[PDB]
Each structure stands twice: as structure tokens, then as C-alpha cells.
Amino acid sequence: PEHYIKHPLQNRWALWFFKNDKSKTWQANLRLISKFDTVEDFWALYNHIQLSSNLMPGCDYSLFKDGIEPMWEDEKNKRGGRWLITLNKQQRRSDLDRFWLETLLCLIGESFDDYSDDVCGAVVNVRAKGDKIAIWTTECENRDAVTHIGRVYKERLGLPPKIVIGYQSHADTATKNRFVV
Numbered sequence: 001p002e003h004y005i006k007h008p009l010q011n012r013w014a015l016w017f018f019k020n021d022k023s024k025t026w027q028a029n030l031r032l033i034s035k036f037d038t039v040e041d042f043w044a045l046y047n048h049i050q051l052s053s054n055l056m057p058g059c060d061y062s063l064f065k066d067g068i069e070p071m072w073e074d075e076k077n078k079r080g081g082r083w084l085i086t087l088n089k090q091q092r093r094s095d096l097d098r099f100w101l102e103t104l105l106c107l108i109g110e111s112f113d114d115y116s117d118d119v120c121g122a123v124v125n126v127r128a129k130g131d132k133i134a135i136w137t138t139e140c141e142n143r144d145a146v147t148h149i150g151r152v153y154k155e156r157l158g159l160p161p162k163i164v165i166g167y168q169s170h171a172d173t174a175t176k177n178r179f180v181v
């Protein structure tokens with residue numbers, strides 16, 4: 001068995017793509033690429049798509065658990081929020097791709113212990129003004145889950161203790177940090 005079975009992931013995941021088109025609504029610009037639920041199928045997908053740093057400004061990738069759309073309105077995101085990584089323009093070259101892949105691995109490898117169940121997915125925004133990476137979680141009032149996910153994520157990214165990252169609820173973003181680590 002170990003010689004021919006793929007390695008199943010805890011969760012099936014869906015990769016989404018967003019291309020800004022002023023001709024369409026935001027939701028009409030968001031498309032599902034494909035889904036996977038093994039390590040092998042994850043790396044097959046990741047190895048055939050563009051690195052985030054090579055996307056055009058205005059594009060996103062989103063990696064979300066099967067059944068959760070990468071939008072605030074999903075029942076699993078409307079009460080939640082995001083740990084937000086803000087990148088300056090110089091970090092598109094130095095950090096964006098390595099941070100995104102670490103984020104992807106934090107998700108599929110369930111790296112936040114028993115609070116990995118609060119994780120909905122992650123989004124990378126490629127923007128001329130500054131790129132963003134974020135991990136979305138389901139409930140912004142869950143202090144322990146949100147704090148634990150942020151502390152782990154910060155250290156997995158290897159961010160310096162001299163900086164903080166913040167967590168904002170989607171309700172506030174849709175109209176301030178609820179947590180900082």
C-alpha cells in the first residue's frame with residue numbers, strides 16, 4: 001500500500017482565481033480552478049500554475065476548504081476575519097512566493113493543532129500598491145483559536161519578533177485590528 005497509494009490530506013481544498021475585470025462584478029471575476037485532496041495532487045496543481053509574483057496586478061489566488069467560497073458572504077466567513085500579511089513593493093520579489101507557499105502548507109498540513117478547524121482558507125492579492133496574504137478563520141470572537149493561529153502563522157512565516165501582524169473581521173473590512181501578535 002505504502003508503495004502505490006497517494007497520501008490523502010485531512011481536507012479537500014479548492015483553488016480559486018480572481019482576475020480584475022472592470023466589465024464584471026467582483027463575484028463574476030472569481031472562478032474555481034480545481035480541487036485536490038492528496039499531497040500529490042496538490043503539488044501537481046501548484047507546479048502547473050503561475051507563481052503569485054508573476055500574476056498581473058489585480059489578481060488573486062484563494063485556497064479554501066471544499067464547500068467554502070472565498071468571499072465574506074459564505075456562511076463560514078461572515079462571522080470571521082483574517083490574519084493579514086501586508087507586503088511592501090520590494091517584498092513581491094523577496095517574500096511573496098515563499099510566504100504564499102508556506103501559507104498553503106500551513107493549510108493543507110493542518111498546522112494550527114486543534115484550531116485548524118477554525119481555518120477557512122487563505123488569499124493572496126497581487127496589487128501594484130502592495131501585495132497581501134491572509135489566512136481566513138471562521139469566527140472572530142474565538143479568542144483562543146484566532147490567537148493561536150496567529151502566533152503559529154507568524155512563526156511559520158519566520159517574521160521578526162520586532163513586527164506585529166493584525167487580525168481584522170470581515171464585517172469591519174466590508175464597511176482596525178481585533179488582535180495583534
Ligand SMILES: CO[C@@H]1[C@H](O)[C@@H](COP(=O)(O)O[P@](=O)(S)OP(=O)(O)O)O[C@H]1n1c[n+](C)c2c(=O)[nH]c(N)nc21
Pocket residue numbers: 026027070071072073125127132
Ligand atoms: C465590493 O468591493 C469589495 C472591495 O472593496 C473590493 C476590493 O477588495 P480587495 O480585497 O481586492 O482590496 P485590495 O485591492 S488588496 O485593496 P483594499 O481595498 O483591501 O486596500 O473588492 C470587493 N470585494 C473583496 N472581497 C474579498 C469581497 C468579498 O468577499 N465579497 C464581495 N461581495 N466583494 C468583495
